[PDB]
Design an enzyme around this catalytic site. Structure first.
Site, short mmCIF file in Angstrom:
data_model
loop_
_atom_site.label_atom_id
_atom_site.label_comp_id
_atom_site.label_asym_id
_atom_site.label_seq_id
_atom_site.Cartn_x
_atom_site.Cartn_y
_atom_site.Cartn_z
N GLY A 10 0.76 -1.23 0.00
CA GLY A 10 0.00 0.00 0.00
C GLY A 10 0.80 1.29 0.00
O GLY A 10 0.19 2.36 -0.07
N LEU A 16 12.95 6.16 -9.25
CA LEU A 16 14.36 6.46 -9.42
C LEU A 16 14.98 6.65 -8.04
O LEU A 16 14.50 7.43 -7.23
CB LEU A 16 14.52 7.68 -10.31
N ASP A 44 19.29 3.64 -2.11
CA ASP A 44 19.51 2.20 -1.97
C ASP A 44 20.81 1.97 -1.21
O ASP A 44 21.87 2.41 -1.67
CB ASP A 44 19.59 1.51 -3.33
N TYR A 49 27.87 -2.71 2.21
CA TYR A 49 28.56 -1.65 1.48
C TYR A 49 29.50 -0.85 2.38
O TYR A 49 30.35 -0.11 1.87
CB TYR A 49 27.57 -0.69 0.78
N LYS A 78 19.40 -3.76 3.20
CA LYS A 78 19.43 -5.18 2.90
C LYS A 78 20.14 -5.94 4.00
O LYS A 78 21.19 -5.50 4.50
CB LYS A 78 20.12 -5.47 1.55
N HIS A 111 19.29 -9.75 1.04
CA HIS A 111 20.22 -9.28 -0.01
C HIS A 111 20.50 -10.34 -1.06
O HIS A 111 20.53 -10.04 -2.26
CB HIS A 111 21.51 -8.79 0.68
#
Ligand code: NAP
Ligand code: 4G7
Ligand code: 2WR
EC number: 1.1.1.21
Length: 316
Positions: A10, A16, A44, A49, A78, A111
């Site tokens: 929802g 982008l 993201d 990372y 993730k 991930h």
């Protein structure tokens, strides 16, 4: 084109976003600040990372400056492979929340479908270089993700790098409480993903395209590898539309009803890459770009090709 796509929880997700893998920690705070200033509302992220603290500095400052409100941002992270066990999922999510300096994520993804042995190493290896698996299965990890929704830590949950049979396994899970909202997969003109995209879309799962520019900064790139940004055929489509090649590569997934997350740390490219909502690729352009598929996959780990849940033995 409309800026957001409706998810099966929802909520609306900006189509982008800014990618952050490989964005150096000394550059990513400014990258995210610039991105928010020039209109990005989706970032993201991932614990693996190693730059979520610095991403979070940028988010927090733009919230403090009242450039944006929290409800206008869509922050994704993730769960890394060494945290697939039941007793580790919440703490992994909370570390990401603490680093990003948030009290919820908009979307939290598994991930990879492959769980690894917990510990300090992100890729625990045996003496021959094979990744050491966890025995925790996909479905139990999914139940742990569902708990995060029910505890208020995340607004949506999803998956990444799942093949269609692995998506189906979750959709068929006994007692499934929340469907995946998103499957984030590699997708670009050299890996067009028609079969997996149609499967996911038919089930109401939104697909996010990662490495849309072909990840030219991937650490394992070779000089001889194919290059989307340098492909003269794509450059020609861009020239016809008076746009850059990157702008075509970003608009392409958008017109397939995908979300797309190009990465840059270059301020002028961050701004350029957002200027994609006001031109159209024709149907013929779209089919021509699709025709470039070569099943050229850039993102996978050799150390994982014997893991029981390795996703890329299956055709799709
Ligand atoms: N779920 C997963 O397993 C997974 C895997 C891979 C990626 N991802 C996500 O997807 C994001 C994007 O993928 P990616 O980082 O692999 O690669 P990408 O976005 O395909 O390409 C990034 C590269 O393109 C360059 N670039 C960006 N805009 C450009 C432009 N306008 N002109 C020329 N070059 C340009 C960047 O350079 P500069 O930065 O120097 O400007 C960087 O070297 C990641 O950052 C990550 O957030 C997720
Ligand atoms: O994964 C991403 O988002 C982007 O790539 C990375 C980023 C990192 F910070 C560190 C390593 C990678 C990486 O090797 N990925 C590939 C990967 C990872 C886990 C399992 C498998 C598998 O084949 O099962 C494949
Ligand atoms: N995915 C690949 O094609 C790849 C090629 C060479 C390389 F050294 C690494 C690579 O991916 C990462 C990995 O295997 O860990």
């Amino acid at each position: 084109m409309a800026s957001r796509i409706l998810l099966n929880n929802g909520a609306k997700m900006p189509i982008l976003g800014l990618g952050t893998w490989k964005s150096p920690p000394g550059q990513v705070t400014e990258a995210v600040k610039v991105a928010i200033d020039v209109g990005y509302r989706h970032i993201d992220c991932a614990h693996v990372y190693q730059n979520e603290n610095e991403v979070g500095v940028a988010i927090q400052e733009k919230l403090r400056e009242q450039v944006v409100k929290r409800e206008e941002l869509f922050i994704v992270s993730k769960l890394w492979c060494t945290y697939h066990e039941k007793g580790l999922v919440k703490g992994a999510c909370q570390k990401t929340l603490s680093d990003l300096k948030l009290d919820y994520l908009d979307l939290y993804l598994i991930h990879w479908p492959t769980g690894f042995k917990p510990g300090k190493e992100f890729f625990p290896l045996d003496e021959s270089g094979n990744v050491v698996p966890s025995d925790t299965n996909i479905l139990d990890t999914w139940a742990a993700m569902e708990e995060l929704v029910d505890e208020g830590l995340v607004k949506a949950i999803g998956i990444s790098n799942f093949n269609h049979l692995q998506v189906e396994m979750i959709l068929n899970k006994p007692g499934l409480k929340y469907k995946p909202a998103v499957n984030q997969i590699e997708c670009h003109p050299y890996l067009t993903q028609e079969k997996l995209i149609q499967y996911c879309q038919s089930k109401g799962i939104v697909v996010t395209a990662y490495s849309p520019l072909g990840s030219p900064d991937r650490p394992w790139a070779k000089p001889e590898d194919p290059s989307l940004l340098e492909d003269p055929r794509i450059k020609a489509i861009a020239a016809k539309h008076n746009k850059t090649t990157a702008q075509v590569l970003i608009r392409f997934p958008m017109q397939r009803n995908l979300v797309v997350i190009p990465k840059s740390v270059t301020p002028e490219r961050i701004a350029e890459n957002f200027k994609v909502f006001d031109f159209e690729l024709s149907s013929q352009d779209m089919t021509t770009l699709l025709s470039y598929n070569r099943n050229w996959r850039v993102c996978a780990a050799l150390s994982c090709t014997s893991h029981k849940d390795y996703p890329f033995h299956e055709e799709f």
